[PDB]
Amino acid sequence: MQGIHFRRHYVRHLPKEVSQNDIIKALASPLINDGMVVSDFADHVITREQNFPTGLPVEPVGVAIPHTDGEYVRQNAISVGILAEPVNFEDATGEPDPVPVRVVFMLALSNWDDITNVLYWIKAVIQDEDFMQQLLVMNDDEIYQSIYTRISELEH
Amino acid sequence: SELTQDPAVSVALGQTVRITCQGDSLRSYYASWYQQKPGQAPVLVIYGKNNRPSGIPDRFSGSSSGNTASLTITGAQAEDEADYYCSSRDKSGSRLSVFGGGTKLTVLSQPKAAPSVTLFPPSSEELQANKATLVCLISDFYPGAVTVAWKADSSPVKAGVETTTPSKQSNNKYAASSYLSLTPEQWKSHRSYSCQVTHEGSTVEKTVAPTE
Amino acid sequence: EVQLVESGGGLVKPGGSLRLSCAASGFTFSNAWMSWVRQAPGKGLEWVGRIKSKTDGGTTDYAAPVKGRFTISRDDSKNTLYLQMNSLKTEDTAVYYCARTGKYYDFWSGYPPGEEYFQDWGRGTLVTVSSASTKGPSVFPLAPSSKSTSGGTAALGCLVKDYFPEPVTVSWNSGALTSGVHTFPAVLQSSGLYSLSSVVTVPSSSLGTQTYICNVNHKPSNTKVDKRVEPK
């Protein structure tokens, strides 16, 4: 519960030529710059996405929660990304049908108790349907505002 | 405790069996399953949402419903005969772990056999040490549901009697032992002592005598 | 490949202290969680406690009957786990196991802090808490006779009587005789001591020629007995 560090440049819009590896690069990059995670953090996130996919077939737009073991995280951090086109992420529950994804929540948590709590709260925010509709229109400066307000409440 | 299991369950070889674990915390958390063979440390079988470690047959599978968890063996084999334990949280919101009462799985795996009974009177060396112990050996029987009775002459005795629960031998049959502790005077003052073994409606009685 | 070895078990007087160790080989002990589980003889498994990795804060948790009395400490430098038992009571008599603890959390149907399972188990160390003192076994012969025989095969053995605490290991002819040997589980007599039997099935023809010796080993008393079993 050692605080989820958030900055402005931890939110960015991604172009249309991005694949699954391109996303994990762009979202991790600010986290390794600020010493949040190890140098090869994108490697360990990609490795876990191959073994445990994080595609979520939520309505109306699917999402992905790419993360890794808390062993490769120095400080708790979050990185957000919005995609211009739906990118295929494999289903997390096991259905062979993939999931189109436009919003991606890279989670960088450092200990097991924080992974279970943040992941549980994430399940509630993706069910905020009227919020899953406005995430695709807010720009990189404002997406901060709404999404950071729900981080400052977690300290409860 | 919080988690409750069926004490004993028996299944025919090659058929399906379900072991159930009931607890309040199962409405919030999954349960893992552990198989313990006699004289061996436990081993993990099913954990989480039907996750199975490498080297575990695919006939093992877990499930969950309300406040109950289930371990299903499809087509039970002789190697699956062991004790099974469920493990989960004690209550909701806790970081402690709690095991279930345990379930003894009996896989009826091979044909029925009548028990062979041998009764050992007290040795001369033991009587010369002011002690007397009758040793009754029951071996080579299947299934392992026997009852042992002792007799001083024609009257039964239960005090000073202790019997080990039947255990499997090398030939995959069952064996057990029962003891009667006597004083040397008790041994000399009766005409005979008897060890009755009952296995599926069939009783076998061995008898020893001090004058023999 | 994964190996967990426990040690330090023995007889302890009620109210005494005992420390157990656990040697971990075959994985990254620094990152794995570690649990202690005990099993009283003839009873079920009971969770004792668990220590987290230094990554996850190194927190420790204990069951109610052992909280405050038992303490779990790890040593990543030498890949060893420790269980310090203080104020031991009769109820603590059990085989203590050392288990590598795994973590699990289902995203769609899981509740924090998730579920803990035990992947690899050590062989276990026996702890006996009793005011009764150590006692070496008495070995009496179970000789066959012209009535105890069953045709071509005969049953002979030894009665390992009055010893404390467990265990007792039995062999026949210095391990050269293992065909037909069966050693029964111990039994608790009226004195509070233990007794068991070891019988070997033997051809009746070789009862006057071949000699039979049962070898009894009771390490908690440092006693070894070789008893000759002759017929009649």
Numbering used by the authors:
A (entry chain C): 9 to 164
B (entry chain L): 1 to 212
C (entry chain H): 1 to 232
Paper excerpt:
In all four complexes, the overall structures of the epitope scaffold and the MPER helix were similar to the original T117v2 scaffold complexed with 10E8, with backbone root mean square deviation (bb-r.m.s.d.) values of 0.73, 0.89, 0.75 and 0.62 Å for the 10E8-GT antigens, respectively. In all except complex 3, the antibody engaged the epitope scaffold at an angle closely resembling the interaction between mature 10E8 and the MPER peptide, and the D gene YxFW motif interacted with the engineered D gene binding pocket and adopted a conformation similar to that of mature 10E8 bound to MPER peptide, with all-atom r.m.s.d. values computed over YxFW of 0.5, 0.47 and 0.32 Å for complexes 1, 2 and 4, respectively. In conclusion, despite variability in the angle of binding of diverse precursors, the 10E8 scaffolds stabilized the MPER in the 10E8-bound conformation and consistently engaged the hydrophobic tip of 10E8-class HCDR3s in a manner closely resembling the interaction of mature 10E8 with gp41. Using a combination of structure-based design, computational modeling and directed evolution via yeast surface display, we iteratively optimized binding of T117v2 to 10E8 iGL, UCA and NGS precursors, resulting in a series of immunogens that we refer to as 10E8-GT.
We developed germline-targeting epitope scaffolds with affinity for 10E8-class precursors and engineered nanoparticles for multivalent display. Because the MPER region is sterically occluded at the base of full-length membrane-bound Env and absent from most soluble native-like trimers, epitope scaffold immunogens were previously designed to conformationally stabilize and expose the C-terminal MPER helix. To assess the structural mimicry of the MPER helix within the epitope scaffold and the interaction of the epitope scaffold with the 10E8-class D gene YxFW motif, we determined three crystal structures and one cryoelectron microscopy (cryo-EM) structure of 10E8-GT epitope scaffolds complexed with 10E8-class human antibodies.
